[PDB]
Design an enzyme around this catalytic site. Structure first.
Site, PDB file in Angstrom:
ATOM      1  N   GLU A 259      24.893   7.387   0.672  1.00 30.80           N
ATOM      2  CA  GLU A 259      25.075   7.967   2.019  1.00 30.80           C
ATOM      3  C   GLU A 259      25.414   9.460   1.823  1.00 30.80           C
ATOM      4  OE1 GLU A 259      28.135   7.099   5.785  1.00 30.80           O
ATOM      5  OE2 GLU A 259      28.765   6.608   3.778  1.00 30.80           O
TER       6      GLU A 259
ATOM      7  N   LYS B 101      22.777   5.919  11.478  1.00 25.84           N
ATOM      8  CA  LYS B 101      23.912   5.012  11.297  1.00 25.84           C
ATOM      9  C   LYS B 101      24.495   4.608  12.661  1.00 25.84           C
ATOM     10  CE  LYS B 101      28.193   4.649   8.686  1.00 25.84           C
ATOM     11  NZ  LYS B 101      29.202   5.536   8.028  1.00 25.84           N
TER      12      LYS B 101
ATOM     13  N   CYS C 248      26.607   2.315   4.851  1.00 24.47           N
ATOM     14  CA  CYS C 248      28.055   2.156   4.694  1.00 24.47           C
ATOM     15  C   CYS C 248      28.622   1.041   5.558  1.00 24.47           C
ATOM     16  CB  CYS C 248      28.709   3.560   4.832  1.00 24.47           C
ATOM     17  SG  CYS C 248      30.241   3.782   4.059  1.00 24.47           S
TER      18      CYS C 248
END
Ligand SMILES: [Mg+2]
Lengths: 261, 261
Positions: free
Chosen positions: B41, B112, B145
């Protein structure tokens, strides 16, 4: 609050024997300070049927039948709340159910939603949804066995307010004990998996009953082969606050608009 | 078919340095047979921003910016597919993104969905949903994540036909390495978690990049501290057939009628 599993070895097609063994062990969970006691899946009947006929013959209505009225009697005597797996007769159909009883009487039932392997030949798929029962001092969610495999089982019970998920099981795969603490962590609930032990018509069950915390800690774990009880202390504010840090709340952060679509 | 993670230590606000490190490691992976390579990330910018201005200043456009350009060149020159985390400038707005690039060029991006902690002060929540990218020989799902924490993330991807979930990460909590194999198992999918290492303005990342399989087997795992690559062979039959036994197909067995209600 203390919660407990009862890991026993049900005798196939012998409900009286299983009632006797269960009372003995629930009494020992109670002696140990348990307020909620969880028994395995299908504790009264056993699991590995060759035909539907032999289970249908012995299977009891809920709440009218012997297993519910038995468990009411043990609840009353011991002062504990009990979640127990039981074969449920409903007219001409059978379900793989869990009964919830208290010292004051019957609280309600759950019917297993995800049937496993040969259970599809005997039992009808559960039709009551995922239910959460308020016992006053705690909200208890119920799922059974293979329900653990689908993350949506525990998540639905957690959304619905469960502090603890009671989980009667007859586990045969090696995975559920490793997966249970992840279920507990991802929902910030306690989980009480009451497994059975033994070998039944060629099928060996894994035991390893366990209590998991919302921090994925294993608070109690049972052997692979022995009947036993396991009791663990639980923190009811450690579950009801879904904060994971000062900026994230696990239920506030879910974004349902993007799920499954 | 071989997939890989690149576990590296992004230098905050030094994209040149990070491109150079990424190129060395992507080539180590490409040499070891990898056809899919996943980077951490925010590998280009770093993570631990104090102001939105410092990341805005350097954040690149997708696909025309320098990070995507860099990655296309590397993938053109190595023959690999790359999934990499990158701070995306989109006009006057920033996203915490992952880009998928092949030898043809740029295949697509993911934004995300579940922002973590201070990220909400810099980035907008992702608005493209959970996407699955067809490479021909395999379908790659992408999440980033904290998306791991919500079971719904991997589940959406697996339902959309992902054979492997590419998962750029910058982990600080210890739970993901223990949960990822359960995400792999419950969806019958492979997962590739590419974590960073290092300490960034005092914040320590935990490394522990891993590749998990549909049987909850961890096939490769990295250290807490060192920059490295991990490569593993994946079996696409084992993902595409959702049957765990003769009578249970995990997607046919889902009962969405009782989920989250
Ligand atoms: Mg290693």
């Amino acid at each position: 609050v203390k919660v407990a599993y009862v890991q026993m070895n049900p005798q196939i097609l012998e409900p009286d024997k299983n009632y006797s063994k269960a009372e003995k062990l629930i009494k020992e969970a109670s002696k140990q300070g348990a307020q909620l006691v969880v028994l395995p899946e299908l504790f009264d009947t056993g699991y590995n049927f060759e035909t539907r006929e032999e289970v249908f013959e012995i299977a009891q209505k809920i709440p009218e039948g012997e297993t519910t009225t038995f468990l009411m009697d043990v609840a009353r005597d011991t002062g504990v709340y009990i979640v127990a797996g039981t074969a449920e007769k409903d007219g001409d159909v059978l379900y793989n159910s869990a009964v919830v009883v208290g010292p004051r009487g019957f609280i309600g039932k759950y019917r297993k939603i995800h049937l496993f392997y040969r259970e599809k030949f005997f039992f009808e798929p559960g039709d009551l949804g995922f239910r959460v029962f308020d016992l006053g001092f705690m909200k208890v969610g119920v799922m059974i066995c293979f329900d653990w495999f689908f993350p949506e089982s525990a998540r639905t019970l957690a959304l619905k307010g469960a502090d603890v998920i009671a989980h009667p099981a007859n586990l045969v795969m090696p995975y559920a004990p490793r997966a249970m603490p992840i279920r507990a962590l991802e929902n910030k609930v306690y989980t009480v998996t009451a497994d059975r032990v033994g070998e039944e018509r060629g099928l060996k069950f894994i035991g390893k009953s366990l209590i998991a915390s919302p921090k994925a800690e294993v608070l109690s774990m049972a052997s692979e082969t022995e009947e036993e009880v396991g009791v663990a202390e639980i923190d009811l504010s450690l579950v009801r606050n879904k904060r994971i840090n000062d900026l994230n709340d696990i239920f506030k952060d879910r974004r349902e608009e993007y799920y499954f679509r």
